[PDB]
Design a protein around this ligand. Structure first.
Ligand SMILES: O=C(Cn1nnnc1-c1ccccc1Cl)NNC(=O)Nc1ccc2ccn(-c3ccccc3Cl)c2c1
Ligand SMILES: [K+]
Length: 319
């Protein structure tokens, strides 16, 4: 007893056991199958033409025979389109990527209780809460092939997967210290590469790794990163102090996007604060509110600029 979905690009079929897994209070594998078919039909207009109209309206998720018939209609339509193409690798759309990440998460995180997350943002609600904000952050910073991206404390790795599917950075890294999310990230990585292949979608190179971003190895790695993403909201003063020290080695124009600012937005350099990280970085509050309909969130863009410190010395020497 199983259900199979043929890949639109000839990759290995997606195979689901029956009874289908139940993901959470609202989602299940049955709806993932239906939504997957709907996304492939949107992607391939010829595919939408070949299928019978009722198939994606008249279905019973609690019936094996009904789910099997739905899968068979999609599979036969895929076969017809593959025959049509016989006779004569792009980036995913935002909507498809949200679906892919959800699919990757549900196939990877089978024990939801394991991830100690009673916070307003948690991996299980990534698509609902966080996805649109990360999509807004990606649009704002405009990364190129010259950039190296690092998410410090990447958890299960969804921010890294999203940025990698959207930009052309040389490489994207996710570093996670905690055992439970770092182990889940290994499955997330495998499931992401697999599903992206299944849809025939392109992503940049990325690595999800286990490690402490405050270690000696990571000092030089942070120094050579051009774009850092860091959710520092829950960080203690010591971690925050250690991080500012890592940032002090970054190159001019290096950028840090965080959930809480590392320096005051109105920092004014003087003789008593020359030690502060504000002496070497611009800070701006960015908000999706400035057609947004999500939570009234803000994020902070820090840019390495030692001319702040240089101008203060110039103004002292040349009044
Ligand atoms: O565990 C994860 C990603 N991940 N993967 N699956 N779920 C999550 C997740 C889990 C808990 C909380 C938030 C998230 Cl996204 N660490 N990486 C991460 O947080 N990067 C990040 C970096 C910079 C900013 C600036 C604003 N934010 C932000 C702050 C609050 C809410 C959303 C966003 Cl995107 C940021 C988020
Ligand atoms: K039709």
């Amino acid at each position: 007893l199983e259900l199979r979905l043929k890949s639109p690009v000839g990759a290995e079929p997606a195979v689901y056991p029956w009874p289908l897994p139940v993901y959470d209070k609202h989602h299940d594998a049955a709806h993932e199958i239906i939504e997957t078919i709907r996304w492939v039909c949107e992607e391939i207009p010829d595919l939408k033409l070949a299928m019978e109209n009722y198939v994606l309206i008249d279905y019973d998720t609690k019936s094996f025979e009904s789910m099997q018939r739905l899968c068979d209609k999609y599979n036969r339509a895929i076969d017809s389109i593959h025959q049509l193409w016989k006779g004569t690798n792009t980036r995913p759309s935002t909507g498809l990527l949200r679906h892919i990440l959800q699919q990757v998460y549900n196939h990877s995180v089978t024990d939801p209780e394991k991830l100690n997350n009673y916070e307003p943002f948690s991996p299980e609600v990534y698509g609902e809460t966080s996805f649109d904000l990360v999509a807004q952050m990606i649009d704002e910073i405009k990364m190129t092939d010259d950039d190296l991206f690092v998410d410090l404390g990447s958890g299960v790795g969804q921010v890294v997967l999203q940025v990698a599917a959207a930009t052309n950075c040389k490489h994207h890294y996710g570093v996670e210290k905690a055992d439970i999310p770092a182990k889940y990230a290994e499955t997330m990585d495998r499931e992401f590469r697999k599903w992206m292949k299944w849809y025939g979608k392109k992503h940049a190179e990325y690595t999800l790794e286990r490690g402490d971003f405050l270690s000696e190895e990571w000092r030089e790695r942070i120094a050579n990163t051009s774009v850092i993403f860091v959710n520092n909201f829950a960080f203690g003063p010591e971690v925050d102090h250690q991080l500012k020290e890592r940032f002090a080695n970054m190159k001019e124009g290096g950028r840090i996007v965080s959930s809480k600012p590392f320096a005051p937005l109105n920092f004014r350099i003087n003789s008593r604060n020359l030690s502060d990280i504000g002496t070497i970085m611009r800070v701006v509050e960015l908000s999706p509110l400035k057609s947004w309909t999500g939570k009234p969130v803000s994020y902070y863009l820090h840019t390495i600029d030692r001319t702040i410190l240089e101008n203060y010395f110039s103004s002292l020497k040349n009044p």
